[PDB]
Ligand binder design. Sequence first.
Ligand SMILES: Cc1cn([C@H]2C[C@H](O)[C@@H](COP(=O)(O)OP(=O)(O)OP(=O)(O)O)O2)c(=O)[nH]c1=O
Ligand SMILES: Cc1cn([C@H]2C[C@H](O)[C@@H](COP(=O)(O)OP(=O)(O)OP(=O)(O)O)O2)c(=O)[nH]c1=O
Ligand SMILES: [Mg+2]
Ligand SMILES: [Mg+2]
Lengths: 738, 714
Amino acid sequence: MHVIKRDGRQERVMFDKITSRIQKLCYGLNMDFVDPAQITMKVIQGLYSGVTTVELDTLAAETAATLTTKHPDYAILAARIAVSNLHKETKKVFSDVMEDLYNYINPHNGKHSPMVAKSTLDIVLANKDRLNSAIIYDRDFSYNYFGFKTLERSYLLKINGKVAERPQHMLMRVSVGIHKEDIDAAIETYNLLSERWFTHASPTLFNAGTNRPQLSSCFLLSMKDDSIEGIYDTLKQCALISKSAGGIGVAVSCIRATGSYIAGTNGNSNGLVPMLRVYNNTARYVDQGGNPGAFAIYLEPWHLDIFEFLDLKKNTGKEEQRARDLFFALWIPDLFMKRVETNQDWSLMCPNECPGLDEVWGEEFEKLYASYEKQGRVRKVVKAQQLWYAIIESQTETGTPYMLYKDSCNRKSNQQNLGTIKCSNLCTEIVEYTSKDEVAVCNLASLALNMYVTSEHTYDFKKLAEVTKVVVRNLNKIIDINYYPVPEACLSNKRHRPIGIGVQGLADAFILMRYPFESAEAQLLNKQIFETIYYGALEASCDLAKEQGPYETYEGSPVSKGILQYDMWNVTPTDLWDWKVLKEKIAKYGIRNSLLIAPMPTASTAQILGNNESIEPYTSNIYTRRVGEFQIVNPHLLKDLTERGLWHEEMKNQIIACNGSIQSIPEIPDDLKQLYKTVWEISQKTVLKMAAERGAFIDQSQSLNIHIAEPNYGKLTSMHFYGWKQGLKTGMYYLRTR
Amino acid sequence: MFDKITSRIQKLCYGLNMDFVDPAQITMKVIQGLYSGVTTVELDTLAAETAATLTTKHPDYAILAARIAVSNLHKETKKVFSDVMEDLYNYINPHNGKHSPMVAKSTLDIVLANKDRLNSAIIYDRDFSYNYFGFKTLERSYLLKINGKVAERPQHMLMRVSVGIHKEDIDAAIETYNLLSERWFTHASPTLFNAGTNRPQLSSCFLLSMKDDSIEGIYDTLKQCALISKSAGGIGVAVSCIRATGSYIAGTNGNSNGLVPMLRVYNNTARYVDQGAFAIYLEPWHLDIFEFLDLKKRDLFFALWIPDLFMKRVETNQDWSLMCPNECPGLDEVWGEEFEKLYASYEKQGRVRKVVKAQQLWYAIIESQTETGTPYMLYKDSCNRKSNQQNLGTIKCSNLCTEIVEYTSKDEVAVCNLASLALNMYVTSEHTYDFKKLAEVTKVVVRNLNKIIDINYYPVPEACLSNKRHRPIGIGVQGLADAFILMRYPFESAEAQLLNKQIFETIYYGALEASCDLAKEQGPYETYEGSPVSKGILQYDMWNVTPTDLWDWKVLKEKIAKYGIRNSLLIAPMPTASTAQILGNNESIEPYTSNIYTRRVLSGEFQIVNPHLLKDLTERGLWHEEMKNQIIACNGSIQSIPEIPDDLKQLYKTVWEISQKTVLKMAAERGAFIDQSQSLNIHIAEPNYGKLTSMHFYGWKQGLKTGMYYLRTR
Ligand SMILES: Cc1cn([C@H]2C[C@H](O)[C@@H](COP(=O)(O)OP(=O)(O)OP(=O)(O)O)O2)c(=O)[nH]c1=O
Ligand SMILES: Cc1cn([C@H]2C[C@H](O)[C@@H](COP(=O)(O)OP(=O)(O)OP(=O)(O)O)O2)c(=O)[nH]c1=O
Ligand SMILES: [Mg+2]
Ligand SMILES: [Mg+2]
C-alpha cells in the first residue's frame, strides 16, 4: 500500500510513521488514555492505495474524533491533526494572506473583488514586521475538532473554495479591523482572542477589516405609525437590514386591530395577520440570496389581535393565517399578570381607539388603560386566564412566544430617560430604545468564564475585570467603524452608544470549581462573576468618558443620578468590589455607554471555544455534534470517570439509556452525580432565581431558555409567575421539552 | 284586493309593451305575500322582484321592476339636492362622535351658493331610465348611504359628480349633468364614487416601472404599489430589469432568488391592501420567463411585453436567447431596431444565460393561456412605434386591462383618466348614425377629463408629475354590439365594418378638436414639442391608413399645427365592466358573448336574454319556455333553432360564432384611430394550439398593440 505525498511522490504506508506523526501532536495530552497507535489502527483498516496524505490526514482526524467517547483529549488531537494539515495547505505569513485576499479576482466575472479593505491592508503593510511576528501559530492547536470544523466552514476566508486563512490570521485581521493604527491595542486584542479569554460575535469575526464592515448584526425597530406608509417604510427598513444579515426585533402594537375603521377608505382593517404575512414573505425573500431573514415580532397582550397572533406559528393551520418564518414574542405589562392570578377580566383594545398604550409603562400604563376601560373604549373583554391559557397552549405546541416583562424592562433601564422601550431583539437579551428616528443596534461579545478558574480551584476576579475592560473598549471602537444598513441605526448607536457583553462556559466554570449548578457555592460564584463583569465594564466606560466625554443622552439617565443596575433591583452587592469608589469616579466623568451587559446565545462562538452555551447548564452528559454525526460525552465528566477507572463501553450505553443522565448509575459516587446533573434534573425555579440574582448586575437582559421535560399548564404557569415575581426582564426565551 | 294591486302596477306601465307585460302576473305573486300588518312598501319590493324575474318574458319587465324600485326610493329619499348634500356633509359618525363629512366642504359651499340653479336643473324622472339590474348596481355601490339607508338619488349622485368636476363653472356642471343623466356617456367608476368628496381619487389606472435592480428599489416600488392600492386604482408593473434566479449578488456574495419570491411579496401586498390588482409585465428574453409562465398556474395578473424579434424567431423556427438584465443591461430601455441591435450584440458577445428553441418558449406561453387565460399579449414595438409619447423614451408596460400605453420612469408613474361613450345612444330612429352628435359629446368628455387631471387626489407625487407633464386621457366606448344590432347590422358585416371605422374616426376627430381648442385657451402640454403630433403625424398616419371622407382631417391638422394639443393621448377603449352594467349596454367593443346569461342581485338570481333578441322573438310569436331552454342547451346560441329566420340568426351570433380574425381585423381598423390600445379578449370555443398560434400571429401582423387581453375557452 502506498500514499501519495503532497509532492506527488509515492510512499509506503507504515504503522510506525503514521503513529509517529500523531505522537508529535500529543504535547500536554493525557497519554494514560490517549493512544496514537489506536488511531493508526482504525485508519489503516479502511485504506486503499492511491490515497493522498491530505486524505490520510482527514481520515485520521475524523477517526481521532470518534474516539472522543474514550477520552475528550482525542477531540483536541483530532483538531491538532486537521490544523497540522491546514498549516501545510496555507501560507505562513499574515501580511501575505492579506495581500492574497485583497488581490482576489473572481474567476467567472474577471472583476477585482478584494476580500479585505484597502485601508486594512495598508495598515498591515505599514506594520508588517511587528504584526507578522506577534502571531503564535501554536495557538491554532488549542481547539477541539468540532470547534475547528465550525471555524473551517464559515470563518476562515476562502480563496476559490480553498481555505487561505489560518485561525491566527483571522484573529489578527479582526484585531487590525477593530484597532487600525493602534498596533499596541491590536496586539493586545489578538493575544486575548487567540488565548481564548473572550470572543467577538460572529458578525465581527466575519467582517472585521473588510469593506463596508457589518460588525454588529442585531437590530430593533418600532412600527413607525399606523398607516400603509408607515408599515411599508418599516418593511423596507427590515428588508435592508436583512440584506446585511441583520436579525431583528419589531414592535407591532401600534397597528390597528382587525375590523377597525379606516376613515380614509371607508373600509375596515385586515389587522396584524395579513400584514405579518408580508413581513414573513419578506423574511423568506431577502435571505442574502439562495440561503431566511429572522424577524421577532413583539405584541402587547392588550391588543385585540392577540389570539390570532398566538396562532401564526402553529404548524397545523390554514397557510393564509400562518407566518411560520417569523418568531414571536410578548411584551407584557404587570397589569396582565396581576389580572391572571387574581382571575379578573382583561380588555382587548384597538390602538387606534386607545392610542399610546405602547408609549407608556408601569403606573402610567395602568392608569391610561384603566380610563380607556372606564370610558367603554374596549373591543372585547375575556377572562384574563383565557388569554393566559392561549399563551401556554402556544408554548406547548411551538415553544413560543418569548416572555418579556415590559415594566421590568423599562423600570430598570438606564435608557429610561429616552422614553418607553417598546421591544427586545431576536434573542430577547437586548432592551434598547426605538422610535421613528431610531433603530437600535446590538454590539456584542462574550467572555469565556471557564478561563478565569485557576489550578487551585479559585476564581480570578481581577483577570475577568481586566479582560472586560478591553472588551468594552473594542465594542466601543466597533460603534464607530460599523457600516450601518439604515441611517436610523447609525443615529441610535452614535447617540446612546449601547453595548452588550455576554458570557459562555458558565457551566464549565462551575464544574472546574467543582460546584453543582444548584449549590450555595455556585449561587454565590454566580453573583460574584456578574458583579465583576459589571464593575470592570463601568470602569472602562468611565475611563473612555474621561478621555472622550459621555454619550449624548447621558444627562438625565439613572447612572447620571448615581443609580446603577442593582439599585434598580434593590440589591446590595457583596463585599467583593468597592462600588462607592466606582460611583465616585462615575460622578466625575460619566460613562461612554448607556448600556453594557447582555448575555446572548452563543450558539456558534461557544462551539468554537469548546464551552457550553451562555449561562446554561449542560443539557445532557452525552450529546451529538453534526459535521457525519459525532457522539460526544461531557468532557469534564469523562475525565472524572476515566481518572477513577470507571469508564467502559456499557457505561456509555447506560447513560444513553438514561437520556444523558448519570443519576441512577450505582458505580458513580454521589458528589459526581450532583456535579453532572442535566438541565432536565435541575430546578427551573433555581435557574430563574440564579438569573435574577445575576440580573441585578445586567443593565440589559438575558436569553433564558427554560427546560421542562413533560409540561402541563400548572408547570408552565408556576414557572412563568415565579420568573415574573423574581423581577426578570426576559422570563423565557425558548421553552424546551422532550 | 287583486284589483288594487294590479292597478298600482299598471300605473307604472306607461309606454311599455302591453302585449307581453301583464300586471296581473305580478299580482299573483304579490297577493300571496299578504298578511295583517303588511305595508305597501314591503309589497312594493315583492312586486319589483317578481317583475324582475319576469324579465325573461320581455325586457320591459325589467323596466317595470326599476320603476317600482325607484318609486320606493323616491318616497324614502329627500327631493331637493342641496338638502341631501347638506345631510351628507353634516354626518356625525356615532361610533366615535367625530364629524365625518361624506361630501367635501368646497363642493357643499358651491352647491349652497348656487342651489337655486342646481336644485331646479335636475330631472328626477331620469331616475327611471335604468333597468332593474342597472339600478341595483347603482344602489349597492354608487349612491351614498347614511346608516344603511340610501340618501342619494341617482340624480343627486350625477349632479354631485358634475359640480365635483366643474366646481364654480355652473354652466359646464349642468351641461355635464344633462349628458350624464341622459346617458350619452359615463365617467369611470372612481370618478362616480369620489367626485365632490374629501378624497377625490378619480383615476382608474396606474402604471409603474421597477426603479432599480436592488432591495432598495424593489421595496420603494412596493411601497408605491401599496400607496396606490390604498386608492383602489389598478396597477401595471414592469419588472424586466430585476436580475434572474441564480445571478450573483456582489454586496452579499450570494445568488439572487429571481422573480418568483419577489412576486410573492407583491402578491401578498395586493391581498393586504384592498380598500388589490397588480398586472406584472415581463419581456420574453428574461431568464425567469418559464417560471413566470407558472405563477398563476396568484392575486397578480400576468402579461408579456413582446418584441417583434421574438415573434420573428418563433415563426422562422430559430433559437431564442434567455438573458439576465444584470449581465445584459438596457434591453427594456430600448425598442425596435435599437433593441434588436443591442440584443444581437449581447448574443454575439456570448453573454446569454440560456438558449432555447423559440418555439419551446412559444408553446409554454400557449399552454399557460389555455389553462389560465393569461398572460396578456402586448406587442412592445407596436406600442412604442405608434405612440405619441415616444419622444419621452421607451414605454415599458401597459396597465391592468391592457388599454393604456403610457410612459413610466423613476420619476413618473402614469395614471389614466377615463370615460366611455354609450354608442347605442347615437343610432337614430331612422336607423342612421349621428356622428355629429358623437363628436359633440366627445368634445365635452375631453374637457371633463382635463379638469379631472387638475383636481385629482394623487396617491404618490410621481403620479401627479406624470399627469401634469403629459396630460394623457383615455376615452373609451360601450354598447358597440348594441349599436350594430340597433342598425340591424351583423357584427362581421361590411356595414358593421365600415360603421366601426366611422365611429372611431369620429371619436378621434372630436377628441383632437377639443384638445386643440384647449391648447389654444391654455397652451399645449409641457412635453408636446418633439412628439409625433407636433410633426403633423396623427395616429392613423402611423398605421398607414387614409381615413374615410366623413371628416375633414386637412382642416383639423391645420388647427393642430397652429395651436397644438392639450393632451398627449386621448383614446383607450377599456373593459367598462361596471358602468356598462349600469347603463344596460354590452361592454366595450365586444360582441354579445351569449344570448342568455344570469345576473345575481344579493340573494336573487335572474335569467336575462339579449333584450334585442327577446324583442325580435316575442314580436314574431316565437318566444316560449321550451325555446328559452333550447337556447340555454346551446350555450346561449340560436344558430340551431329551426323556427328562427336566418336574418335574426346572422344578427345574434355569439362571440363564439364570430370569426376571431374578423374581430382582430376590426380591432386593427379602429385601432388606427386609437391613441393608446384596446382591451381585446379572444374567444375560442374548442381551442387547439394551432388555432391560438394563428390568432396571435394574425393580430401581431395586423399591427395591434394589444394582441390579447384574456383568452376565453368556455
Ligand atoms: C388602506 C388599508 C389600510 N389598512 C390598515 C393599515 C393601517 O394599520 C390602518 C390605517 O391605514 P392608513 O394608510 O393610515 O389609512 P387612512 O389614513 O386612509 O385611514 P385613517 O385616516 O383612518 O388612518 O389600516 C388595511 O388593513 N388595509 C388597507 O387596505
Ligand atoms: C440581498 C438580496 C438581493 N436579492 C436580489 C434583489 C435584486 O434584484 C438583486 C440585487 O440586490 P442588491 O440590493 O442590489 O444587492 P447588492 O447591491 O449588495 O449586490 P450588487 O452589487 O450585485 O447589486 O438581488 C435577492 O433575491 N435576495 C437577497 O437576499
Ligand atoms: Mg392614516
Ligand atoms: Mg445593488
